[PDB]
Design a protein around this ligand. Structure first.
Ligand code: CA
Length: 113
């Protein structure tokens, strides 16, 4: 269980459960950053980024996705660290799902506003 996190602080670091050890099977995590209008959240992935992937289909197993207003980033998976995101928003949703198998270390991000 890792759904429904809510952060109103302007700074923080967020990780997949158990990072940098493997994240649980069948994860459904969500993290909302809820700041006053006018703040603009910037996000960066840090350290090891390792989400299961597939060699032909884009992120069909596990992934992180970020939403702010109508804008979506991701899904992201694999071993490449996503590029930094300047959301231009005060209200951000970070979603992570995993399927029922595999072994991958997960992700770490920091945010600021
Ligand atoms: Ca998996």
């Amino acid at each position: 269980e890792c759904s429904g996190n809510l952060f109103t602080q302007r700074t923080g670091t967020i990780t997949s459960p158990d990072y940098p050890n493997p994240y649980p099977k069948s994860s459904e995590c969500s993290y909302t950053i809820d700041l006053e209008e006018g703040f603009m959240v910037t996000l960066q992935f840090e350290d090891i980024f390792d989400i299961e992937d597939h060699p032909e289909v884009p992120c069909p197993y596990d992934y992180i996705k970020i939403k702010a207003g109508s804008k979506v980033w991701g899904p992201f998976c694999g071993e490449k660290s996503p590029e930094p995101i300047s959301t231009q928003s005060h209200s951000i949703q970070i979603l992570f799902r995993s399927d029922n198998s595999g072994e991958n270390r997960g992700w770490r991000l920091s945010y600021r506003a």
